[PDB]
């Protein structure tokens, strides 16, 4: 009955699949989708905070459904009804030009029998991991407008000290992408029950 | 038949041991009619049921029911027979002990996890373990830290890419381990004296490997370890001598290069008989025994003893003669040390340093080929008898005492 | 919101390539050889819009304007199986049909009479992007067309869009083959200069590397144009695999640049690509690694210490980042990779997935695009080509008649510079005083 | 780390013993003639790096250095199965395709005109080589390429690698048959000068010897050169298949040297073989190994001098008994089946090895035997007698006078009839007690 009843939920309420779009759209693994996406956030803000815009959930929402019919991972009925919204306003009180903060929270929908599985504990570290992920792309944002720059024209010391510091922050990167990226996302991917397990779900 | 020691009041004259003994006698109320072998068996047989349950859970198959007819039938006998009892449990542990042997040697790829000890453990393959020495010897002749342990695994998995090991699965499954006092939270005084190695036995054979075992590994290690380096500071210093050829010889050079080459053949026959005529001897005696026969214990056995006769005749149990060779393979290792950084005449200080170690080295060589002398005659000892014989086979070691190179610095 | 990417296809050479590029993208996406995405596709979870735009008939038409002085090429994309993959509305042909008659100086002033036509395409495909990050031109760099009329588009695109990307896959000619075109040394000056001077990155497709893999790893006994092409094609693939296929590293054509060209000059990356016929981490390393798999001649001048500044290696298939970096660590340990001396080894990886609709053998495939001082070989030769004609004054009658090269050969000559230029400046990058 | 060793291959008969040494190399580690792994040697326990370069697509590409002075082995080598073996870039050779025409003169000009190119060689062998330990060449000293070439290597492999071992395989000229090479003797002689003063170690490969091999126990009436290179192969390979492949015993260089040449002078090495037939026990092998119809190595048994061994190694390549090989020790001892220095204990190691698994052995037992023997004397007393010959008649001098190395005077030949001289008197010393005063 056990193995029956899991199996069921598996193949029936794809649990593996939510898991899947959560790690998609809620930890931010769709690249061309999110360099296209942020870039054309930070059009309408930049500079770390937002300069009084993505205050409410309107704005940063309709440049999302723009956004959703281009992606690398998404266009799936798990890769719908994706929730964006703000766990803070965006208004410091000490605006800053160099900043690379980015925090918002995107969620996946899940079913109900299977939200005893991926619960919010899970969520919630996915999108830490978003917005980890999203103040990286920030700061690949401004150093593509600041290439952008220099190739539409001192000079080029500000360039040998943008390559090493672009060569550290990379290995940096890589470092973090290999082992916060990488492993766990194997054994997220790889870790789906199949014998039919309820727990298993849950506790992977 | 099924490992459940019901002894809720301490009834049975079986007690549980200490879990890692899971199972024990209690010999204070064993019945007399019950021989001791026969005790024994029938420890040995619940052993292997308990564990094969306790592994189904992480042997007799069907034939459960039909034992117990038999001893229903037994039971329902009018006179104990110890006889028929002993028989029907013979029988039993015979058809267990063939099945965990069908399982061991099929399932359990034994030989595979003998050449891995072999290689590893054993130093089997000597050319791959002289490029580990090689690739750790920085590692190694600084006392272990916390991170001389991984800086010397790294070096292992390059020597092994520089031998073409890339392929083997198993270095993964082997860690070279590092005794650092540091690592707690005495300090080895050198690398050298704190690497280990780890093999990630797989089931069963951590049946096999127990602490004891694993522990005896480690002793061999080490021993082949401490042979290899001495030889092959012996072997450098040769080579730095002959890099010297061209050069004008020194008196002091020759001395060195005579004590050098006489050190070195004695460190090597002697290592060259505990290898082959002990060593050697015994592990393919092991190996033939656990080929030959279809029962796990038996193939247990025989590797026991080949480890036991590659210990004894390595004088490792000999404890005396075991730190009377250690100390010649240091006096080698000095020896080979002094020729390295004097490769030309030695300077006062090195000079006064090679006839220490030439005299030092005569010393304790005429005590050990008069002691292996000794050890051959009272002892029938392939190896020693060996060892001895190639120490005074033109008599030269016999008219030096023993001694490899008795002639002045 | 999207990323289109305009691809110019200049020349036989450059339509050839983009139409076998259209054909492995359609592939990747599951779209049908006539654009539309095939039924077991359209779920897909390959990214399509990187590479190809969605009409809103569930049609993938790729973002391509092919513009030719020469009728052949665009012919034959019309006429072919593909002709509706393309955009036909995006194709610029040059009534003209003369070409640029393997004339570099013929072919920019073809490139100036058909600038409205081929700028018209590459301003519709920037619309049509929804993130426009820039424009890739696929051309050669031998013949007349692609490099003087490819010049004349890379200059126009500079100027119109100074703020995006000016991607090149720039065909350098065979130096051990007699060029059809006689004039090629001077063509390839020129190309060899515009990709330094106007381009972020140029991917350099070296025929003779190709036919050498080919013959030694392919079997192909005298590859043919098509198979020539069909490895441009798949070179193309690969380096737009990140965009085309979700990954979760260098994901992007800006990041790819970015990682490949750290001096805007010194922007030409070899390709290698891995098997050339179960890959692991370190079997695709060493294979890459391997002189045979690699898909750029570069002259091995024994003179100049050449090194790698970057390697970037895009391996598509089921890859663990682990095990990638894994293999990474093996190959450094072995010292299959020399890493640029000024710097820490840079050594990134890209993991992409494989087409679909392609049955691949292999669980993992990999392509390496390298930044190495010894591409300046390939330089090198092409300035000494272009100096050798251009003091013999060889094949310039066909020049004279184009007004870049009516009075002298100055564009020729400072092509050349431009070029040595480039040879000394990935020499230097090579050194620890690149700096 | 590997510890590489670059193999050159000199002259003629130099290129064509390491074609056949490479040949035996690639059947014992299961290596293609194209340098691919066979299946079945995919997983061998032997260390191929010592001797094969991995190539990053898994082909095994030799270090040798092929160096020849005449175009036809140079041309063999790249007609035949193993071209791909070698790295062509590890490659020298003489663009003056007249040969050292068996004068070490000649040779040693030869040496002279692709020093570039040899060095050249030699250096991207070291650099291809984990630990590159030396350069052995592998040479006749009868030739004119591998004796004169031969000798000019040596000289510049020891002034360029000073803490390098220079080894040479030095093939020897049957000494029973009239030398074709009015100036092979001149040749021989510089080559032994050369191994005596920039080598450390020279093992004679003496063709006499090889030819009395081939008679009485391969069969073989009038044995070619190419019999006497598959021999020299297979002496190769049995002698580096503890550094190649991983044994318990003397798996080094430096340990080999150390255990085998207490005397730098007594450099001339004998080799035996056993069984030497066209169930070989231990003691049987020994047995067959101490006779003398068994020893691959020419040299005089003088009656005078009481030649004796400084050391012997024998290598036991197969499936072995240790407690026969003990047994065998054992009974050659008191056999006196092998005479040892008097000056020292008899040293006889023995060091058992596995067969190649890639390696079809017609012998479940296959067995080497190193004798450092004074006997060995004789061998250097007529190399000597033989430079002395030719120097004092000035036999085939006028084509030495055109090359460098004779245009003034025959020093290089006196000196080196000289050094051979002083050579046997040594190894006839170390038959003696005195051998320590000697």
């Known amino acids: ?204 | 038949l099924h490992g459940l020691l019901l002894d809720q009041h301490e009834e049975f004259f079986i007690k549980q041991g200490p879990s890692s003994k899971q199972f024990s006698l209690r010999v204070e109320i064993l019945p007399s009619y019950i021989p001791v072998r026969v005790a024994e068996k029938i420890l040995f047989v619940g052993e292997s049921v308990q564990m094969f349950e306790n592994q189904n859970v992480n042997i007799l198959k069907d034939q459960e029911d039909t034992f117990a007819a038999e001893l229903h039938r037994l039971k329902q006998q009018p006179l104990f027979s110890l006889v028929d009892f002993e028989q029907v449990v013979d029988r039993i542990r015979s058809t267990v002990a063939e099945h965990l042997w069908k399982l061991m040697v099929e399932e359990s790829d034994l030989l595979g996890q003998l050449k891995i000890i072999k290689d590893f453990y054993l130093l089997g393959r000597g050319e791959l373990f002289q490029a580990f020495i090689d690739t750790a010897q920085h590692m190694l002749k600084t006392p272990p830290t916390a991170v001389t342990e991984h800086d010397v695994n790294v070096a292992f998995q390059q020597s092994a890419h520089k031998v073409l090991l890339d392929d083997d699965n198993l270095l993964p499954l082997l860690h070279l381990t590092i005794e650092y006092h540091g690592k707690e939270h005495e300090a080895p005084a050198s690398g050298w004296a704190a690497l280990g190695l780890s093999y990630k036995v797989q089931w069963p054979l951590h049946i096999l490997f127990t602490p004891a075992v694993l522990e005896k590994y480690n002793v061999v290690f080490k021993y082949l370890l401490s042979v290899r380096r001495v030889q092959a500071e012996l072997q450098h210093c040769w080579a730095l001598q002959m890099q010297r050829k061209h050069l004008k010889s020194n008196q002091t050079d020759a001395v060195k290069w005579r004590l050098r080459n006489h050190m070195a053949f004695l460190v090597d026959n002697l290592q060259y008989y505990l290898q082959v005529d002990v060593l050697e001897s015994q592990f393919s005696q092991l190996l033939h025994q656990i080929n030959s026969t279809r029962d796990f214990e038996s193939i247990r056995l025989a590797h026991d003893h080949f480890l036991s006769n590659l210990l004894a005749q390595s004088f490792i149990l000999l404890k005396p003669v075991f730190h009377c060779l250690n100390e010649i393979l240091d006096l080698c290792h000095s020896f080979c040390s002094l020729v390295s950084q004097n490769l030309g005449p030695l300077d006062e200080r090195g000079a006064a340093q090679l006839s220490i170690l030439v005299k030092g080295f005569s010393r304790q060589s005429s005590l050990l080929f008069k002691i292996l002398s000794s050890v051959r005659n009272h002892q029938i000892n392939s190896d020693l008898a060996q060892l001895l014989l190639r120490l005074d086979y033109n008599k030269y070691y016999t008219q030096a005492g023993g001694t490899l190179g008795s002639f002045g610095m | 919101m999207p990323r289109e990417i305009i691809t110019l296809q200049l020349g036989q050479c450059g339509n050839q390539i983009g139409f076998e590029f259209w054909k492995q993208l359609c592939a990747e996406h599951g779209i049908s050889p006539e654009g539309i995405v095939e039924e077991f596709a359209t779920e897909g979870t390959d990214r399509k819009d990187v590479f190809f735009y969605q009409a809103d008939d569930e049609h993938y038409i790729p973002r391509a304007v092919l513009l030719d002085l020469e009728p052949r090429v665009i012919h034959s994309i019309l006429n072919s199986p593909y002709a509706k993959l393309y955009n036909p509305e995006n194709i610029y042909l040059s009534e003209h049909g003369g070409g640029a008659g393997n004339n570099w100086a013929s072919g920019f002033s073809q490139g100036e009479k058909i600038h409205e036509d081929i700028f018209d395409i590459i301003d519709r495909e920037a619309d049509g992007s929804d993130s426009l990050e820039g424009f890739v031109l696929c051309h050669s760099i031998a013949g007349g067309t692609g490099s003087g009329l490819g010049s004349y588009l890379l200059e126009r695109l500079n100027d119109r869009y100074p703020k995006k990307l000016v991607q090149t896959y720039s065909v350098f000619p065979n130096q051990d083959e007699m060029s059809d075109v006689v004039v090629q040394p001077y063509n390839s000056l020129l190309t060899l200069k515009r990709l330094t001077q106007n381009a972020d990155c140029v991917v350099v497709l070296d025929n003779t590397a190709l036919n050498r893999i080919a013959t030694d790893r392919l079997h192909i006994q005298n590859p043919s144009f098509s198979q020539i092409n069909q490895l441009v094609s798949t070179i193309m693939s690969a380096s737009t695999t990140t965009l085309r296929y979700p990954g979760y590293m260098n994901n992007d054509l800006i990041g790819l640049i970015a990682s490949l060209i750290p001096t805007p000059r010194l922007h030409f990356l070899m390709t290698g690509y891995t098997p050339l016929t179960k890959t692991t981490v370190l079997d695709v390393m060493r294979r890459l690694l391997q002189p045979k798999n690699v898909m750029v001649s570069t002259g091995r001048d024994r003179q100049t210490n050449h090194c790698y500044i970057a390697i970037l290696n895009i391996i598509q298939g089921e890859v663990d980042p682990t095990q990638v970096h894994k293999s990474l660590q093996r190959i450094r340990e072995r010292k299959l990779a020399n890493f640029i001396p000024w710097g820490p080894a840079s050594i990134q990886v890209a993991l992409s997935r494989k087409s679909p609709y392609l049955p691949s053998a292999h669980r993992v495939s990999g392509l390496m695009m390298a930044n190495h001082t010894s591409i300046s070989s390939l330089f090198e030769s092409s300035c000494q080509q272009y100096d050798k004609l251009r003091k013999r004054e060889a094949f310039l009658e066909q020049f004279r008649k184009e007004d870049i090269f009516k009075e002298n050969f100055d564009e020729l000559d400072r092509s050349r510079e431009v070029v040595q230029e480039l040879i000394d400046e990935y020499h230097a990058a090579t050194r620890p005083d690149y700096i």
Not at chain 1, 42 to 67: H, I, R, Y
Not at chain 1, 121 to 144: E, N
Request: with cysteine.
């Open chain 1, 1 to 204: 009955v056990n193995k029956a009843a899991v199996d069921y939920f598996f193949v029936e309420l794809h649990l593996g699949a939510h898991f899947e779009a959560l790690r998609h759209f809620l930890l931010m693994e769709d690249g061309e989708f999110a360099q296209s996406l942020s870039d054309l956030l930070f059009e309408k803000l930049g500079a770390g905070q937002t300069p009084g815009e993505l205050l409410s959930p309107l704005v940063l929402n309709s440049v999302l459904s723009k956004a959703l019919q281009y992606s690398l991972h998404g266009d799936t009925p798990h890769a719908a009804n994706l929730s964006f919204a703000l766990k803070f306003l965006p208004e410091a009180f000490a605006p800053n030009a160099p900043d690379v903060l980015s925090c918002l929270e995107l969620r996946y929908k899940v079913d109900w029998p299977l939200n005893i599985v991926v619960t919010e504990g899970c969520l919630s570290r996915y999108s830490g991991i978003f917005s980890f992920l999203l103040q990286l792309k920030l700061m690949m944002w401004t150093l593509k407008d600041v290439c952008f720059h220099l190739k539409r024209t001192q000079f080029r010391q500000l360039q040998l000290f943008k390559h090493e510091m672009q060569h550290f922050v990379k290995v940096i990167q890589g470092y973090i992408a290999n082992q916060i990226l990488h492993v766990t996302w194997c054994e997220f991917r790889a870790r789906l029950a199949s014998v039919g397990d309820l727990e298993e779900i849950q506790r992977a």
